Amino acid sequence: ASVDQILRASYRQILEKEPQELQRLSVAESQLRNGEISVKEFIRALGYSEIYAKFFLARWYNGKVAEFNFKHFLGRQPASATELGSHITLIGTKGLKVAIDTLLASQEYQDNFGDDTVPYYRLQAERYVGTTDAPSRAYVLARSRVQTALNKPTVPSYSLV
Amino acid sequence: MLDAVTKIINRTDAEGRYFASKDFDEVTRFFATGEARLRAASTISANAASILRESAAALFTEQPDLLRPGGNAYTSRRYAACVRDMEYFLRYATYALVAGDTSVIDERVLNGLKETYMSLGVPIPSTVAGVTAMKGVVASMIGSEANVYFDHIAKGLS
Amino acid sequence: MLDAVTKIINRTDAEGRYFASKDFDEVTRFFATGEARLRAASTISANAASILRESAAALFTEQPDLLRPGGNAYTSRRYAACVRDMEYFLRYATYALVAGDTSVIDERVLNGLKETYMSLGVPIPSTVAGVTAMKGVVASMIGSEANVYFDHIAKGLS
Amino acid sequence: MLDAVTKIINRTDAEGRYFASKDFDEVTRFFATGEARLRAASTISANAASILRESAAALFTEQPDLLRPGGNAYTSRRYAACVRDMEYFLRYATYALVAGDTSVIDERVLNGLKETYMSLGVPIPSTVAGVTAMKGVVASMIGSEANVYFDHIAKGLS
Amino acid sequence: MLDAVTKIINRTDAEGRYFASKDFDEVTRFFATGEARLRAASTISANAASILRESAAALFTEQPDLLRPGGNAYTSRRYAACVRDMEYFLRYATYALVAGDTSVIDERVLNGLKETYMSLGVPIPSTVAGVTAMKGVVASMIGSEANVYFDHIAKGLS
Amino acid sequence: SAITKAILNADAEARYLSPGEIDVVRGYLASGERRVRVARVLSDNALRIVRGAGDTMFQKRPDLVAPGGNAYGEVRTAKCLRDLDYFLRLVTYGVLAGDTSPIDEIGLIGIKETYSLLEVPVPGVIDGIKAAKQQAAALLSSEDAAEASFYFDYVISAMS
Amino acid sequence: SAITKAILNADAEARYLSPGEIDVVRGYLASGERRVRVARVLSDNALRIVRGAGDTMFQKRPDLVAPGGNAYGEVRTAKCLRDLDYFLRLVTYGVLAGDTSPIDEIGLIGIKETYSLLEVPVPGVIDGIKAAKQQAAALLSSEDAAEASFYFDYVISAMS
């Protein structure tokens, strides 16, 4: 894939917006174009942006922030109350960057996406069974999120789990 | 997840007390039956391919309409998904058998499975029939050792 | 998020009009109370550990059952979660006090908190008792400037 | 990155000493010229599009061979990359003008630029000519206040 | 990483033969020394904080220059990183002791440590002196059981 | 707002307001009366500023209101003057709020592609905004003129 | 538990229990009777173990019970001895489970934050827990004492 496609996909996956709609990360884009940084580094550059906190944390509960983080960086949804609660505690006690770093450093991210692929959703049971505490619940939640992907749901996070 | 020993520990911790004589008796009872359950689980692990083949054969001889076009098990992909689900049930029944508790089935398997099957159009009673067929196949080899865990799965689906 | 000035700007913009005399008086009142509000916020920030210590002590002296086994604050982990939630309440109350507006509490705190507590079995009346204890502890230190924000959290929780 | 004040702090910390009279005089000198440097930065920011426009005009009039086919500026894409590089240089020179220190230029502009330009085939002498032309335009717009940082970029590239 | 049993397996696999009598003798001696190795490893595990404390104390009493301003161990961050490196060395020596082989030290500690220390300006001889101090402290507790692994670390750094 | 930006930074890092954030907020609250004075002067003279800005921009570019121009016609010239009034109101908002967020959410996010679809010439908009800036600086003192010019120049730069 | 740990190890790789995991489970099931004996002995003598540990810890660090100490007063001393009793009960729980997951889930997760906020001296807790370790090692044979010392040392190490 070319850098143009990867950039467009990165902005679509992480910020749910088209590159023309944003103020693009010029220097990170040029570093990715020069091979200085990997796709994963551009992804954390996107997650680290102020626009990410304005989009996904400013007017949202920490449960919603956690669901946003999982959808953007893992390609799935939190399945259990333990996983969701741990991530919420990370956002609330360490900040958003530490929680996003936890998601990107997690073995799930290396296994699914490595260092050179934009994250995506995979509605297969192999996606969840070894990885998730409740694989069937993880499938249901991820499939619901995919089915209405345009929407930013307002149903409480702990209602779903 | 839990096993029987952790369940006893959590109960006693809920009352916030040290283990009493009854708790020690109930945990040595679990230690007593561990060898039989280990042997049965090892037998199931050793013959998983044969058990899966025979169970799928039994299910689709009972309900051949699944294999016909328009059936939920008609394609290479959906047939593979069906046998993979039965393999999941077998493996998690093995986990429950070693653990001595059905909880691993409760969160790992049953939690969200009915929603999955209704959203996918998978026929739930046919899956219960397949689980019962696998229960009979496994029983024929290991005795009645896994009947409770397979019955738990079937009743949770039903 | 929203503070008082952005609230006034949003109102006038939705009416599609420039600021008038009344809006300027309102924003000047905000600028007038701002310095006292920063003093209160800085005092809360500097003494946050002491505030949490006193308020947790007051809560768990009022309700000793929470700490005993079977209580919702009985473990090191559940106690840490409880004091963490009080820390959240104080931090976001300080944010709201600086902003001069409670919308940050509605968005970041209250929305979904009732469902979180119901899902986990946190006793909401006892959490409101903790918020009230915090309100008293903080009022003993800064005066009555943060009373409305704790009252907002308490009304939202109940 | 580093500004002048943090540079003095780090110099005093490397010796493990409190600030002396000399260090306080250097800090006072830095604060003394801060308003003029802010004014120059604001003037540059208000005119960034023009500055870049006639800077590119000067570069490509002094060397029209760059735009002609076979040149490193010959395409819409490579022309836009050239203009983006020059805008980078202007923005980071403005940053260093505010900071009073060339640290940001070294660590985030000059560092690695030489080998990047050789690996790309970018003509470094022509880039130096562009930086000098942009220095001339900015000096005509604000005076000699920003010359040092442009000379720093020019020397680091050359 | 690989332990002693896996090392013998790999050596037998290199020439593609079954284990000979000497291979079984090596395996048997490993199994014979395993219990004492486990005792030493548990002793180090139970006393890791103290071992670390007197190891760092020895290193910085011998070389006070590191802690002074301008030294590589002068800051909160840099002292913490130094002690963290020492804890790394201790833990991976314990892993090597349990495994009975030095592969873990070679692949997870020494691999890329020259380059890292030279890039950051860490004094390698001073790190070696600290490793020697840690070796002496550990030998004071468990005897001569784990000198070989600390010597391996020192010589991989020296 | 300055307060909103500082609180959002603290919240994203899960911490209380830092000494620097507190000093930022204190500076903004101290500048409040000056901000309100400048904003009040700009709001009281909105009609004069917009009328002069439109005059200057149409004098500099008569092609806009000529046949075939973007603003040609009563309704289109009305929309052009209405946009100038919008940007002046947004500049007053930025002056009061101490940052550029109100100008961003209300009027600058999407204005570029909006004006691109409608073939609205952005140099003409910039000329109108510079005219409004000069009309305003006529009404304000030098310090107040500099304060308002910060946000006027921000709008100009964000257009380009 | 030991069994639970093996099952999660198998489940992570989406496979059946390996021969290694089977060996692990069989070893735990064989050790069960010794584990029950050790846990019973610790649980029956819990009161004297905790009392002697508190005595030793307070004589070692009398600053805890001096005015201004964290354990000063009857209520705070009772809280301190209650925490020692808690940790002994979790040591028995961990001896029964054959691993440290009950200890972590009931007593160690959050304890750093709890004691940091309450200003409880963790080194004093560690002295108390080491005292309880010697008290129980007196009650146990060499092998049983070695078995329980693993969990006592685990709690101590998880403190710091």
Add this chain to the structure above:
Amino acid sequence: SAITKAILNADAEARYLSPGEIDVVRGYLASGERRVRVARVLSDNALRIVRGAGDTMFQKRPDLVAPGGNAYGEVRTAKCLRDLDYFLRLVTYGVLAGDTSPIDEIGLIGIKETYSLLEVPVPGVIDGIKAAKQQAAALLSSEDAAEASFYFDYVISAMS
């Protein structure tokens, strides 16, 4: 080994060996003499086991040695017996290690697509390994036969 896996689990969490992992390692060290005896018996009778297993596999599936079979010809039959020797050696490695990693890295990882490219019938390999199971069990005692048949079962399950 069991030691290697325990150390990798400890390194995954940046900690020393937990009481559970120490128990696992102690169990591996205790079972050393039995493992060594089983491996020695399997290694001494390697030729006997391979010949018996190959004969049984070829008799059960004569089409493998029939004309046009994957093992037709003395070279291809020799390579078949050589593969059986390889897998028996791997079973001995697994017995000695206490885990299945030597089997996985040396022979199991990559054998599925290897046999797909070579068109080797995997049911044939499975029947050959089962034949080696019976031959080995005939030479070991019942307990030793079970211990080695754990790894024989692992290989058989991995092939399918």
Add this chain to the structure above:
Amino acid sequence: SAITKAILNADAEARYLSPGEIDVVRGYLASGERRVRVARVLSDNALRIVRGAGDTMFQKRPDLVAPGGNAYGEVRTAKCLRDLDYFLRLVTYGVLAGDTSPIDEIGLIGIKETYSLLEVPVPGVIDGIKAAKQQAAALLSSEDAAEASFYFDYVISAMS
């Protein structure tokens, strides 16, 4: 510093400094003279402040210098007072810089692990820094006292 924080924010968004960032930098530059005089007062009386803060802290917690205390001994007590001098110098760095980055980089990052390992009681350090803040406020006017107390309180908050 204050300037570095604004420039990093602008650079992350790849833009020039916003009007709000310009006001932040301008307010810092205006505050420069009072920051310099506050830091000069703090630096010129560093020995007096550290001596008085050490006296107050050792009177409040005599157990630190009692036998068995962390600060017991001439070397440990002296280098405790050295730590207090470090923290006062860091507070002066903060007063000059206009933010807390020098304090975090030089003294705060890693101090929790450092003090946890070396048995250094954080409440004692907090009492020392509180005494230092009182000594500084005695030497400063009320406004300057609040200015320095911002950074003193930040250091205390980082401790707890």
Add this chain to the structure above:
Amino acid sequence: ARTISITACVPRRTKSVGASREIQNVYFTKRISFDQFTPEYQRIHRQGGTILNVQCMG
């Protein structure tokens, strides 16, 4: 601010072979921040990779 460029060769032995191109993962040089140096150092060691080179440009 400081950053590190690290050159590592990570073999793919533990994984099975795949028809997908994988040479970019095996041998690489990447730019990282200092705060990320330890996590990726340990991550490379976990995967069996060898650290070939470390540089800090300044």
